[PDB]
């Protein structure tokens, strides 16, 4: 089916409501025209993020009642540990409270000041932890990944020429590691092919260069491989995930995305010495290696959720629900990033707001406007998120200036997607009413989370 | 709007197996083609009943953690008591484990042997308790109610002329009470008008006759009054509910329907002497006047659920979701009972399977086909459920030969309704192919529950 | 150990508090000097009953999240069914919402008007359902069971001479069945020996007479066998329970006691025809045979709880905790029923209130006084509970006029038992201050639940 | 009262296996005689830590079902915020996943390289974050605090003369802040007086120096002030807490201790500029200012828990339960650190095992013996945890050679405390029999966590 029904039933519900346009306009101004600054009670359908907003299952909630809260030797840690060993195939696991805790560890463990880390397009917290540990980020994604309207498969793929070039020009000894994200978030949740993961492993291994995956949406990625990469049509999601990680030296994961939980993450690796060092560090920032700043019940929920994520019908429906929203928007002529990604539809703010320059912060502005007009919260994914260049002080200027309608897993229905698609279409009808924004408060890093603006 | 989006979001899901057609055919065969014999774990969408199958909210689940399990004097009882007093406007309430417990008490309290109870059609358990206690049942519903093809509003209304006639012929002192069900189950879930409730109150009061409501689906009823009865457009669901019960001396309620719970019910009355007698009887069958065969946590969940049921958008969506399924089937020419009721759609299997005689069990066979083709369980409400006359050996032969698609509250989406409808519509397109069934195992009693069949 | 520590940890807690003596005195009068009529919020340590007041485990609560709420074919029903078949060894099970639902079924199924039912001392709801179905109750417990101060083991044992006499005098065809309760509640929670269950089975079987157990505290009973009956010291609690039921034709159970749950019960039998008839009847009163007026989650909790009850250390501690309270009271000279039973300490009201006649309702009075002085709720187990004789109209006059400090399972600690033992001792210090009571309101049956009194 | 009964009852239990001594010896052996390597499932009473091991209430569990999981603007954040503002009287709050997350932020915000931080002794993570950020730590605790045998009140007090000296010698501008821990962990859980907190506030304020509290066990601290400091007898715990923090510029809190939760913490401050800087940093390590690496449900549980912790009877019992264990051990002559603190009893293993040298690891071996004899897990806080100097290869040799019996809140009873005490007392009676240990596996770092031993 193009649009399969939900492969589950509703066990329990939460109420939703809208507040009038008048009240919302007030709300937008008080939050400094930053969607991140509005309040949950004041949002009707909350598409700010798929991070930590997922609906758990009855089985996960049963697990939540069996939290073994012991400081060491918790049954829940053992369960998480064996589940991740089985499904991802890495030797060692260190839990963290969420993904950026695992990134903090990896960046501290694996980077010497002055080294390069190369990856398939930047990410916000990722680039910050790289640069903060003294690395220079090098983007080795294909150029097309940066082309919002260009409909090509596996846009997350690393350009092997660009990786080769980097090795020739910098020397392998000066490359800390390759960071391969699956899927790639800021390109629109775009997948990476198995062929590419293999080619990357083969080339890096020849030069002694390590490869670490950002596993945050690895199940979404595995769906796209099953659906689109020749030869995978009859492999299970689980077989695909396990092969994917077989091409990496470890990974970082925000369990708050594809593990179907509201909190949780981990770091995995194969190297014994790196494991020892990681355990020394986790103690500083997260907790003991035996819980990593998580309750036992959350290690349990994450163990159960990661295994539920492997069910074909679940991930099929997850991705196709997002695709439905994208398809409706596209059929009506609304400009979006193509092809639609695994976790969100990204309105292309540049086409949505032609009359604005990117220095007017179109994406940031549009997010505000969608809120005012519809009560739907969405996230800036453009020049604000891109941050400032640490060499020059200027904004980084990403070609992708996008606005994210991000779908939490197992929370909404197609009828909710229809409510969203209608609101957006209507706002499009007068997109020339969307006004320029400028900063009134800029944080020194990760500025998008809490920055505030005023209309120009 | 014809079909509103869900006025809630999903908090947690209930996992399902998603077994394919070929495995569903084997399950159906192991169940002897009787959907009552299917395992819950093998069913995608379970439309067997809207009784006790509802999804609770996060607020209810919070209440579930706050059970005061005291044998007497529980805080949860006091919460339930004050909620029902507020919402229904009865003086006194006695909790019961579900509806038939309340019906048991009412019939023992209110009936002298040889007296008549008259009502708007009947229900099996309700009428059972009436007759076991010495009453003669008299149907006083409008003749129109019995025409399953007649599309008319407020089809559950009592014919005042039949009630007058009853009083004139039998005498007021020989009428135990009038039993008014809101909505009326056996007509397909048909509402009763406020005008009718007042007319019945006025007539009965003039002769000193009591009126007790079967309040099981009273909120669905209130929604039909708000939608369709002139003058109720500025009235809340809560205002409509409170006015309805103001025309009664008390009620029985299966909370498992419109109170949005999985278990629970109660008996209400205004008469102090009846209340006293009820509390003397509740202890024989159910429990204390302050728990009545319910855990404290369930009194809490029912108190919270009944108040949630008052939200306009909730009950609008509830009824319009069922209407969606009915509308879709009718548009494709599928024969159904009309008009569609608040909680279920009934397929007319007599017309669906015109090539089959009632002796070949078309409703039973059609419910089998539906499961095999879609993973949807439905209930036979036809010749099999009618049972066999054990004196003569002849089938009881009901005019209604139906398959009931009963919709639990807040469990399913419109996409699930599409799975149901598309599958039935596809079956209808080659209806002549549906095979008759014959008994291979038949119990002497309760045959619908455990009978097994094979194809002719 | 005499007093083992709790063989579990506290997973979660509930607050407790006391209200001043002044407030309580007011409270006692408003509740008509009937403890059953006070409110949970107004009680500090609630020893009214061990029925439905037990603390569940983490595992049971995990089960509570996996309620399969289907009308038929619930995984929870299957689990309960197989657990009871395995542990009790009966062929068939019909769930009920609690014990008196199962008694209603058994009494209707197994009694012809005018027949006798003989048992080991009466019980309140049991005797009512017998008499209400037309049976005459005959007490065949040993005389010593009625002697409160007499410390003998296995006081619940049936007097085989008395059973033989009954058969000689009435004829076996006129005995509906023998009702054997394990333990026996009103004798002080007194156990029955395996030897006695065997002797009873052998004698009844020879005459074709059926035996049905009241299984409500069967695990407590099995503990006493393990502890005290020669030859059982090395059998497991589970092996003992399974042998016990091997001597019966079925049973009734209030799961609210030894199954460690807050609601739930069942009826078991071996007879296929009785099973069919039971399923016909359960539909009238409780629900479908597939849930019997219980949520799926409660069938699940009861299945899990019955198996947890089999853990030796759990039941050892359960019984010895009660014994601790009894021992402290006895060491101080407070008069109690001896030996202490499995679930409560029964203050002997006759010795506690020598200056009152039993027509002054000493037990009922004392319960009120303990409340006023201590904030501890306890239950009347004497002449009020005994009810009226249905032949003569006079009070039944039990030799045992007792007041029950009933201990919910897994709820309190020894420190709580110490608080209780101190309060009681102090009140003893002036027991001549306890005043006569008389009726001001008497219900027509089971009068103790809601009767009200005034001081004479 | 010396030892109050539990001011709560048990809502639910956590199941335990109850394995006998012989099976415990095998588990201990499989764990290489290191209690840190024991499986939680094999432990009866787990006194490894009071961090994150507490039992929640029914009210907290209700809050757990009400998680608003929004990425920003969660209702649970607003609830936590207003509770902490009300109870602690700080202007601003930033949630963190636990204490060390808050400490990370504070030290980065408040320390310039080369500056001193002075405090009442130190804690490992706290001091780590101080030093990693460029600070020199100076101990300003009273000399008395370091005498582990000295039984004196308010042993956690800062010596004002040491603080004066520090200011005089180094200059106010070179002091980053004073870090005052309430209670003081390393002295055995020793309280700080309100007099001392005011004196420290007055001195620091006069030189413009900031004061930040480690609020981790501030409620235990407040209880000692109420019990022992003149003039605080008419003051509630809440009033004492609010006054304490009125003498600070902010605090860090591991909610996992006195907030009665399994995960959670926060950073508080009064300074608007610091608040702004903190929110810029929280996003790098933890999450949004409105979740800080916590699920919505955990912010809710912590908000509810902190308010429960204010109940006098709760914290009285908490501290007196630990005191009970200490009192019982001392009465039998068992050597312990004095006076007993709010959350743990420390056994002096140097004196307990006088026949052993520190090189034979008496604390480690004693913790092993305790587990084998009782099923109680305790923590080695001695030479093993001190680690090895990797430069010289020599053990770090601490003056304190202790076994920590750390008491989780609301988990255990006095009977459990008796299991602990009776077992230790029995071991003490034949203390000469306790065998020394030697390394068979030693990691280079974090040795206490995974080292394995065998008997000498
Ligand atoms: K149910
Ligand atoms: K209960
Ligand atoms: K924990
Ligand atoms: K969350």
PDB file of N, CA and C and ligand atoms in Angstrom, chain B residues 69-70 294-296, chain C residues 51-53 256 262-263, ligand 2:
ATOM      1  N   UNK B  69      -7.485   1.322  48.157  1.00  0.00           N
ATOM      2  CA  UNK B  69      -8.091  -0.007  48.075  1.00  0.00           C
ATOM      3  C   UNK B  69      -8.834  -0.412  49.346  1.00  0.00           C
ATOM      4  N   UNK B  70      -9.052   0.556  50.225  1.00  0.00           N
ATOM      5  CA  UNK B  70      -9.836   0.334  51.427  1.00  0.00           C
ATOM      6  C   UNK B  70     -11.172  -0.340  51.112  1.00  0.00           C
ATOM      7  N   UNK B 294     -15.794  -3.455  42.605  1.00  0.00           N
ATOM      8  CA  UNK B 294     -14.739  -2.742  41.880  1.00  0.00           C
ATOM      9  C   UNK B 294     -13.537  -2.431  42.784  1.00  0.00           C
ATOM     10  N   UNK B 295     -12.330  -2.526  42.229  1.00  0.00           N
ATOM     11  CA  UNK B 295     -11.149  -1.980  42.911  1.00  0.00           C
ATOM     12  C   UNK B 295     -11.303  -0.439  43.025  1.00  0.00           C
ATOM     13  N   UNK B 296     -10.667   0.154  44.037  1.00  0.00           N
ATOM     14  CA  UNK B 296     -10.621   1.617  44.206  1.00  0.00           C
ATOM     15  C   UNK B 296     -10.129   2.272  42.917  1.00  0.00           C
TER      16      UNK B 296
ATOM     17  N   UNK C  51      -9.191  -8.460  52.717  1.00  0.00           N
ATOM     18  CA  UNK C  51      -9.861  -8.735  51.430  1.00  0.00           C
ATOM     19  C   UNK C  51      -9.689  -7.573  50.462  1.00  0.00           C
ATOM     20  N   UNK C  52      -8.890  -7.793  49.426  1.00  0.00           N
ATOM     21  CA  UNK C  52      -8.714  -6.809  48.388  1.00  0.00           C
ATOM     22  C   UNK C  52      -7.804  -5.634  48.727  1.00  0.00           C
ATOM     23  N   UNK C  53      -7.126  -5.717  49.863  1.00  0.00           N
ATOM     24  CA  UNK C  53      -6.343  -4.608  50.394  1.00  0.00           C
ATOM     25  C   UNK C  53      -4.825  -4.878  50.263  1.00  0.00           C
ATOM     26  N   UNK C 256      -9.086 -11.948  46.035  1.00  0.00           N
ATOM     27  CA  UNK C 256      -8.848 -10.771  46.860  1.00  0.00           C
ATOM     28  C   UNK C 256      -8.143 -11.092  48.185  1.00  0.00           C
ATOM     29  N   UNK C 262      -6.428  -6.986  44.325  1.00  0.00           N
ATOM     30  CA  UNK C 262      -7.340  -6.034  44.898  1.00  0.00           C
ATOM     31  C   UNK C 262      -8.777  -6.317  44.443  1.00  0.00           C
ATOM     32  N   UNK C 263      -8.933  -7.245  43.506  1.00  0.00           N
ATOM     33  CA  UNK C 263     -10.260  -7.624  42.948  1.00  0.00           C
ATOM     34  C   UNK C 263     -10.046  -8.939  42.246  1.00  0.00           C
TER      35      UNK C 263
HETATM   36  K1  LIG E   2      -9.900  -3.294  46.868  1.00  0.00           K
END
